[model samples]
Target: PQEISPPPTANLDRSNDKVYENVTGLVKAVIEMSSKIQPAPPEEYVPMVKEVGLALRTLLATVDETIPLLPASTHREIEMAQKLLNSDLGELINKMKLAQQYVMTSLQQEYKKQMLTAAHALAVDAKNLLDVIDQARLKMLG
Candidate 1:
């Protein structure tokens, strides 16, 4: 049979290739985020925080991808990993709301405050995770 193999391909360069791929991934994700947010009715949107949610998600994923390339022998790399986790914190809660349209506000403290507060706290903690991730990098990087 005739040989059909192409010329030998370059060896995989995990470092640069992955970084480029990750950044490109962030771009696609940001596009996905904007598209996801654009169609939602304005009445359903909370403007200030929504963009934060989207930004963190994109940033978090990028940060995560960069971790392996970071020098693994030092605290810096681990700190970077934490930062990535922080960047993604609120996404789970926000996605839950987006997926199920969780109630934003309660009718009365006596009646629904508990449920509402629980949900709201979940969201806040998620964001805190983002904060911790970034803060770790900021503190450790110096």
Candidate 2:
């Protein structure tokens, strides 16, 4: 009787392999969540705000985990995207948190105002962010 041995293989690094897919999926989810909050009832706003905030957090987490592992060029690109999201989405998330307080109770009338203002601004920025991602995808077509 003879014994068989396993063959050796090359060591591959897939550390940043899914960065693109992860970011693409994250932005898409953000857009999806963003799309729903519009034309919503005042009562419905808080729930959608809650969901969108969660989606934004997921994206931030992705950027935090994936950015350092990427190449320098890609890091620059992702950082720009991160800046846009963190600034714009973070604005909306904060207002949404305040809006939740108003929705839950009648503490401050300004909370509702702030929420609408932030939601509108975030909507526009989110659309632009989507376009940015779309343009990046197009560049690869060549």
Candidate 3:
């Protein structure tokens, strides 16, 4: 009863669904990389952190591409969502770099904690963006 069901018209277009899948997949990969970075050597995990940055860049591009496809009525909402996503992505990358610096400087515990916090924030922001996209999709269908 606590779960609020979506409107029947909320079914997303196949193309939109494909974009969603790609975004989600990339986010998952980033999350995996974040987890892997915690215990690994700096030389080994550094590349993974870079990969997360690249993946996030791709995610931002993908979201940008999807925006114009959405209904014009939802443009403002989608734009705001994109803005939030961008900010969060920047914060995540910053945190990752700081974590990397911490590890290189011998603060292993701080590195782990920062990575964990950044990863969680990234996931939450990504989910919020996806939710906005879902709402736009519902508008398109309705």
Q: Estimate each model's TM-score.
A: 0.32, 0.47, 0.76
Where does candidate 3 stray beyond 4 Å?
Answer: 1-10, 13-16, 104-106
| Candidate 2 vs candidate 3, TM-score winner | 3
lDDT (C-alpha, whole model) for all candidates = 0.42, 0.54, 0.68
TM-score of 3: 0.76
| Candidate 1 per-residue lDDT over residues 22-42, each given as its tens digit | 334444443443345434533
When sorted by TM-score, best at the front, the candidate numbers are 3, 2, 1
Residue 113 lDDT (model 3): 72
lDDT of 2 by residue, 14-126 (tens): 35534344445545655554566544545776666666666666655765675554344445665676677667766766776675556536544466566556655554544
Better of 1 and 3 by TM-score: 3
- The TM-score, computed over Cα atoms with residue i paired to residue i, of candidate 2 is 0.47
Candidate order by lDDT, decreasing, is 3, 2, 1
lDDT value, candidate 3, whole model: 0.68
- Inter-residue clash pairs, candidate 1: 83-133, 86-129, 86-130
Indicate the worst ten consecutive residues by lDDT in candidate 2: 4-13
